[PDB]
Design a protein around this ligand. Structure first.
Ligand SMILES: O=P(O)(O)O[C@H]1[C@H](OP(=O)(O)O)[C@@H](OP(=O)(O)O)[C@H](OP(=O)(O)O)[C@@H](OP(=O)(O)O)[C@H]1OP(=O)(O)O
Ligand SMILES: [Mg+2]
Lengths: 378, 357, 108, 366, 159
RNA sequence: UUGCCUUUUACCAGAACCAUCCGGGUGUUGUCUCCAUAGAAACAGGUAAAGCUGUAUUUUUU
RNA sequence: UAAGUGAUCUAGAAAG
């Protein structure tokens, strides 16, 4: 964008560059123009390669041989027409297609879908461009395949690898794929609402996305998942009842709301002990050095806390910690003990984590449990 | 240079201009040959005020305006080597003495004595003068024997025309002497038809002299006054460096306050938005001023009469290319040059003596 | 817009309308100084390269004589020569002596 | 204004939509590269073809030497010059300077707020603690976004300055005054929190009354003014229940109010510390968009939201110079001012809108 | 804002990118010009890159890539380097690169003009005048491969 | 008049017109409140305190 | 006599 008032009079050297198609977090998307051989180059090049071809044809004549494409390789993709046009599957048919350019031009006047590439024909001239380069370069430039999928709901599917992927309905798929990016935590004005029966906080309505997610969690699926996990935990506790000195593993029956209610939380499992337990200070699962203070508990509680992350809220540990010492230290939905345990599952990323107090020799069981459930909960 | 945006509203502007002239005494308002009117402001702010008054309250018309040009003035560096006459008059020229320039910018015997006081000049040259604006010396050999040299009043007026519209680009002449050397008056002629010849012929002669005198173009220079806080002193210097031809002469420290009321000199061309720029750079601690009462003209660097001369169309032209650019551009402005490509040069025979032989 | 060079305004454009100065501008700012050797070479390649003079000489000569005349005038008008005869006589003398000397010059 | 009128935006300040839709290169001599800064300085001269252009000021050089501390009357920053029984006036006044005059001089040089030692009150609202930051120049090397914010703020300011909205004087019967005149209102001294809570209760009752009146009892108002349907809606029912941009806007304003009042309640109910309250309020004001879909219904509120964002950007980076990053800044004043002015703007609009609405509820539609 | 350390590396990268393409682009040439113009350091970098190319990297390339490189260098040579040219023995692909370069130069400047330009310069490896016993034969021979004059003249001079 | 768009609301941001609204100023009346609550003092002076003037040898008066 | 200061639009709801 040079000086508009001067530029009208004379050509300027370009002085000032305006920002064209900009973006926040500007990853330098390569253009297309760099990956197309500019015409002058193409034409000088053409002259060269055709000259070469001519020379080799003479050589062939002198030698009395068929000038095969084994010898002309390299120049195969160059020149105008493309050298490839010499050895395609039917030149001796296309020899009699004179007046081809004109016919292509006048398709304009005789058809609805007038072709965008009227100006050439691939049979006559071959591929005058090749944009696989553009594809490859672009993927390399958006942090690679590796990094694009952090935007997507690839982590939600839970494949072994993305490399093992290969072998208003169609755009729904597209929307669902970029669920995390599109339904993003950091956002301008978007008002928060949650979809029905779920913890899928949409930051401003999107219709297609909403449709997708709702179909995803049809049949109260979120609630079912929540309850399922709770059941599993209960089962585990029952199994390892005598190992950790537990008097009773009772399920505190909450409303169906609890599963997906986020402002509050009643405890899912309540844990009546045999003896006083001396639980550690609150900590994460993988935080190994659990500090055993003199405080004791006659009763713990286990809560699940399902969540559906975004490309911005995709750490769970922090979230679960927040949840734990939010609902404890909040005068709505009190747990029987302020000392307890809280699990949370990022359903969008399969990122389990849990925070809270720890009975001695319990942590390993919980870690293993979570590992198992994540590997295969129904 | 004003032009009304619509030629339909031209008379109004003329009327408006008249009003402006009446109201703003320090405005030479030359109506240039094209129709494009010239307005000579004292400086920037004054000029702006004038324009505001014109454009708002007298004209009430939209007005095309040239970027601020400066009234240049043609002159010489050395005495004219040749003395080529004029016909269907050979006027030599030379640079007036620098003391005498100043003396001029503010009874024959008495004047002669004065001249000898100024520059110790000869009594012959002292007697024969008739200056204006610079000096018209009637100093051939035959002129004292002759009374064809008499009735030089018409001749002097022709000389006045020369002074008004110089050879280079209708730019007024400054700081130049004019030694006459011959006149081509035949025996039988009417004073009307002879005088009439001599008037434009006088101009031609003057121009010729200038050409042969190694003509140089003179731009003016604003005397500068910049009060600034001492801490922002080198900034000013830097700015001056950024400007062209700008000199800084004494940084007199104004007692009892941080102001270093520094005098300077910016060439009137280079000066434009100087006050504003200074203010910006100085964070509004540099209430600067420009003015022109000394009449301290000076040579634009670089030499007139060059073919290639310069590089840029957009960018500011180099130091040594400058004068030529100013001349050609001003000729274009004044409509003297033919199209884009042209040249200021001598209109005389003998192939210019084969270009100085 | 900024210095005759920004976008008219960011509405429309469908972009930031952010306006960098290029840094090839420094190249376009000083290409004559950078490629001075291009013209320098060229210049070097072509770097080697009477009547009026006569007229000037004549003027100087006659002028000199006229200076003599002036001097005579000075001497007369200042120091005891109120009459016109003195002036005219002086002039005559100048002519005779001057043009004598200059005749000598001519001869040489 | 000049910058506006010529599209010659001074880069530190605002840039507007353009006011509108010989001189050849051969002729002129580009010696001075003629800058935009000049094009507004001497607008009639450097900028040819000006239209609707003001004339700016032009000025004298200021040498107001300020003192640091612990002294008086001293040349510091500058250099010095080269070279019948009666006492003078005000005798027996030995001390030249009083203990306050060191400060009085400073006060004297100050600008309009402190300049003077008497004034009329203004509404907290009417004081602009934030205007003076962005009107004066941005300090030093803030992130691009903050610079943008500054520019945005200036753009607003200039617009406000430019379209003077002269208040009409004949209508000197205010709303409250009018209400005061009648019998059906009484007046009491109530705690602001009480007023808030009572107004949430009142507002809730109002909106529920309206909704039920309409007939659509299946739209359950939550006490947090977050409306949602109870049952799955029959198409007819759904059609009926699309409440318009009046009712929803009312709800949103109450939501806004319900938030800040609730925060105050929390503060005062012993939950949170006053700093926490201040931060809370600030958060609410800067995230009205994110806390209540006001924009949904009346999208021009984006301006207000944008303004708030700008303020936050400005405030924080004057609030976090040496201080690091984090959420703990309060200072809710200028944003609060913004919201007040938005309410001022809308009070007419909602009087009309909801007026018509309830009229329709009562009288049939025309 | 790249420091003086990697400028050379940057230039190398640019060159490699150029090579990757099908043909020589005006684009890269213009970029090279701009950078060169900018700061003396970048001029140095470009030079040293050139040295690296004809020294060691040159012989690794294929005739297409190599040709492109030659073209690029020729374009640069025509303006923003001095024709300093560290150049019998080494004729694997380097000599053909040189051929390409010369071709580019001739196409750009012109034959007689080119000769004049080189005449002004030293040109030790390209145009030796001191015979060195049937060694000018080599250079002369190589330049006869392309349309060049004055080789004959040189041989006449040398006998 | 532009922009997003394309169907309208809702909008983008400029213009010209206009209105609404949040407020403001005074001035006059009246009310409400809290404090109040005297129908006569000078002159002759004195006492004490407040406002101006005062402390001949050529044109004012020695 | 040989570099790099700076200009950074949007932004979501209804009904179709
Ligand atoms: O610029 P915005 O989109 O309005 O977002 C801002 C911004 O965050 P980003 O820079 O990540 O966008 C601020 O970060 P800084 O620029 O100040 O580093 C941050 O302010 P704090 O750093 O003071 O937290 C603030 O967050 P918050 O609202 O918690 O103050 C946050 O606003 P959002 O949280 O609404 O995005
Ligand atoms: Mg319709």
């Amino acid at each position: 964008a040079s000086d508009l008032s001067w530029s009208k009079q004379t050509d300027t050297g370009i002085t000032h560059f305006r920002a064209g198609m900009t973006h926040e977090d500007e990853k330098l998307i390569p253009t297309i123009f760099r990956y197309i051989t500019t015409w002058e180059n193409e034409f000088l090049d053409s002259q060269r390669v055709w000259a070469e071809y001519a020379t080799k044809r003479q050589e062939a004549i002198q030698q009395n041989r068929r000038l095969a494409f084994e010898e002309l390789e390299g120049s195969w993709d160059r020149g105008i027409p493309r050298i490839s046009t010499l050895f395609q599957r039917d030149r001796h048919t296309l020899a009699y297609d004179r007046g081809h350019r004109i016919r292509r031009e006048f398709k304009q006047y005789s058809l609805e879908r007038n072709s965008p590439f009227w100006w050439t024909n691939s049979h006559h001239d071959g591929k005058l461009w090749n944009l696989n380069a553009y594809r490859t370069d672009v993927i390399q430039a958006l942090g690679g395949i590796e990094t694009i999928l952090e935007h997507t709901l690839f982590k939600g599917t839970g494949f072994n690898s993305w490399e093992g992927l290969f072998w208003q309905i169609p755009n729904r798929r597209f929307t669902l794929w970029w669920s995390p990016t599109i339904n993003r935590a950091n956002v301008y004005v978007g008002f928060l609402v949650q979809l029905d029966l779920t913890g899928i906080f949409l930051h401003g309505k999107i219709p297609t996305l909403k449709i997708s997610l709702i179909q995803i969690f049809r049949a109260h699926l979120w609630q079912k998942i929540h309850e399922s996990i709770v059941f599993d935990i209960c089962q585990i506790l029952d199994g390892e009842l005598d190992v950790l000195q537990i008097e009773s593993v009772t399920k505190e029956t909450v409303h169906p709301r609890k599963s997906y209610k986020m402002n509050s939380s009643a405890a899912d499992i309540t844990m009546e002990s045999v003896h006083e337990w001396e639980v550690s200070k609150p900590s994460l699962l993988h935080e190994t050095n659990d500090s055993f203070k003199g405080l004791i508990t006659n009763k713990m509680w286990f809560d699940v806390q399902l969540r559906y992350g975004d490309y911005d809220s995709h750490d769970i540990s922090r979230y679960v910690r927040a949840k734990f010492l939010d609902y404890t230290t909040d005068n709505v939905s009190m747990y029987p003990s302020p000392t307890g345990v809280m699990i949370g599952i990022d359903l969008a990323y399969n990122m389990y984590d849990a925070y809270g107090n720890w009975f001695n020799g319990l942590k390993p069981l919980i870690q293993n449990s979570m590992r198992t459930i994540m590997k295969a909960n129904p | 240079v004003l032009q009304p945006l619509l030629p339909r509203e031209l008379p109004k502007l003329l009327d408006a201009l008249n009003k402006i002239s009446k109201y703003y005494p320090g405005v030479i308002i030359k109506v240039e040959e094209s129709g494009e009117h010239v307005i000579l402001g004292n400086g920037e702010l004054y000029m702006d005020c004038l324009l505001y008054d014109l454009r708002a309250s007298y004209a009430k018309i939209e007005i095309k305006i040239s970027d601020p040009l400066t009234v240049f003035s043609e002159s010489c560096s050395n005495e004219s080597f040749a003395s080529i006459p004029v016909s269907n008059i050979s006027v030599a020229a030379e640079p007036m003495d620098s003391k005498m320039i100043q003396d001029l910018s503010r009874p024959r015997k008495l004047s002669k004595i004065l001249r000898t006081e100024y520059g110790w000049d000869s009594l012959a040259s002292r007697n024969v003068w008739s200056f204006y604006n610079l000096i018209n010396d009637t100093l051939p050999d035959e002129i004292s024997p002759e009374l064809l040299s008499k009735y030089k009043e018409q001749i002097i007026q022709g000389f006045y025309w020369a002074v008004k519209e110089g050879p280079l680009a209708e730019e007024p002449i400054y700081g130049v002497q004019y030694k006459l050397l011959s006149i081509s008056v035949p025996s039988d002629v009417n004073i009307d038809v002879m005088k009439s010849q001599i008037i434009p012929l006088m101009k031609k002669a003057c121009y010729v002299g200038l050409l042969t005198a190694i003509p140089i173009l003179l731009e003016p220079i604003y005397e500068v006054d910049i009060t600034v806080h001492a801490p922002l002193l080198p900034i000013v210097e830097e700015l001056m460096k950024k400007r062209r031809g700008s000199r800084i002469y004494k940084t007199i420290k104004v007692a009892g306050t941080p102001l270093l009321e520094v005098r300077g000199q910016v060439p009137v061309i280079e000066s434009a938005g100087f006050e504003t720029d200074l203010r910006l750079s100085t964070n509004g601690l540099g209430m600067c001023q420009l003015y022109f009462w000394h009449k301290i003209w000076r040579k634009v660097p670089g030499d007139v009469l060059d073919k290639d001369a310069f590089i840029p169309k957009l960018k500011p032209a180099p130091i040594n290319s400058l004068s030529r650019d100013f001349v050609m551009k001003t000729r274009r402005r004044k409509g003297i040059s033919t199209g884009g490509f042209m040249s200021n040069d001598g209109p005389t025979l003998e192939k210019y003596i084969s270009a100085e032989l | 817009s900024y210095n005759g060079i920004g976008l008219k305004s960011a509405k429309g454009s469908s972009t930031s309308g952010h306006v960098q100065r290029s840094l090839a501008s420094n190249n376009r700012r000083r290409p004559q100084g950078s490629q001075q050797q291009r013209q320098q070479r060229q210049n070097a390649i072509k770097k080697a390269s009477l009547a009026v003079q006569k007229q000037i000489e004549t003027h100087m000569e006659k002028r000199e004589i006229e200076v003599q005349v002036s001097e005579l005038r000075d001497r007369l008008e200042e120091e005891e020569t109120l009459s016109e005869e003195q002036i005219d006589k002086k002039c005559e003398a100048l002519r005779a002596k001057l043009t004598n000397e200059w005749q000598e010059q001519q001869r040489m | 204004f000049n910058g506006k009128a010529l599209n010659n935006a001074i880069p530190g300040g605002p840039k507007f939509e353009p006011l509108y839709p010989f001189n050849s290169i051969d002729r002129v001599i580009f010696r001075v590269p003629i800058r935009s800064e000049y094009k507004v300085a001497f607008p009639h001269l450097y900028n040819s073809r000006p239209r609707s252009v003001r004339i700016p000021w032009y000025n004298n050089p200021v040498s107001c030497i300020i003192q640091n501390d612990e002294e008086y009357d001293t040349p510091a920053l500058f250099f010095d010059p080269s070279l019948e029984d009666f006492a003078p006036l005000l005798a027996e006044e030995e001390e030249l300077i009083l203990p306050n005059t060191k400060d009085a001089m400073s006060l004297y040089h100050s600008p309009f707020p402190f300049n003077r030692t008497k004034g009329k009150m203004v509404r907290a609202q009417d004081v602009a603690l934030a205007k003076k930051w962005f009107l004066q120049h941005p300090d030093e090397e803030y992130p691009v976004k903050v610079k943008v914010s500054y520019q945005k703020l200036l753009k607003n300011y200039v617009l406000n300055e430019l379209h003077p909205t002269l208040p009409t004087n004949h209508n000197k019967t205010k709303l409250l005054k009018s209400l005061k005149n009648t019998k059906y209102f009484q007046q009491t001294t109530i705690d602001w929190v009480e007023a808030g809570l009572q107004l949430c209760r009142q507002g809730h009752n109002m909106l529920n009354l309206l909704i039920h009146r309409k007939g659509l009892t299946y739209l359950h108002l939550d006490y947090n003014f977050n409306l949602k349907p109870t049952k799955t809606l029959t198409t007819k029912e759904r059609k009926k229940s699309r409440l318009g941009n009046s009712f929803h806007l009312m709800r949103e304003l109450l939501k806004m109010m319900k938030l800040i009042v609730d925060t105050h309640v929390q503060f005062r109910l012993g939950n949170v510390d006053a700093f926490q309250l201040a931060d809370g309020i600030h958060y609410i004001l800067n995230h009205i968009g994110q806390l209540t879909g006001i924009y949904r219904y009346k999208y021009k509120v984006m301006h207000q939201i944008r303004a708030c964002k700008d303020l936050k950007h400005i405030i924080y980076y004057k609030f976090n110079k040496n201080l690091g990053k984090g959420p703990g800044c309060g200072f809710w004043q200028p944003a609060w001012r913004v919201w007040l002015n938005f309410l001022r703007g809308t009070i007419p609009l909602l009087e009309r809108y909801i007026g018509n609405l309830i009229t329709r509820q009562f009288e049939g539609r025309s | 804002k790249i420091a003086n350390n990697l400028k050379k590396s940057v230039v190398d990268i640019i060159i490699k990118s150029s090579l990757q393409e099908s043909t020589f682009s005006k684009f890269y040439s213009i970029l090279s010009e701009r950078m060169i113009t900018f700061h003396r350091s970048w001029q140095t970098a470009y030079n040293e890159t050139f040295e690296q190319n004809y020294t060691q990297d040159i012989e690794d390339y294929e005739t297409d890539q190599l040709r492109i490189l030659g073209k690029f260098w020729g374009h640069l040579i025509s303006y923003e380097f001095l024709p300093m040219d560290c150049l019998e023995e080494s004729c694997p692909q380097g000599r053909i690169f040189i051929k390409f370069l010369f071709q580019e130069l001739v196409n750009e400047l012109g034959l007689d003009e080119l000769q004049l330009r080189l005449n002004s310069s030293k040109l030790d490896g390209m145009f030796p005048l001191e015979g060195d016993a049937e060694h000018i034969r080599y250079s002369i021979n190589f330049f006869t491969a392309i349309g060049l004059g004055l080789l004959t003249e040189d041989m006449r001079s040398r006998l």
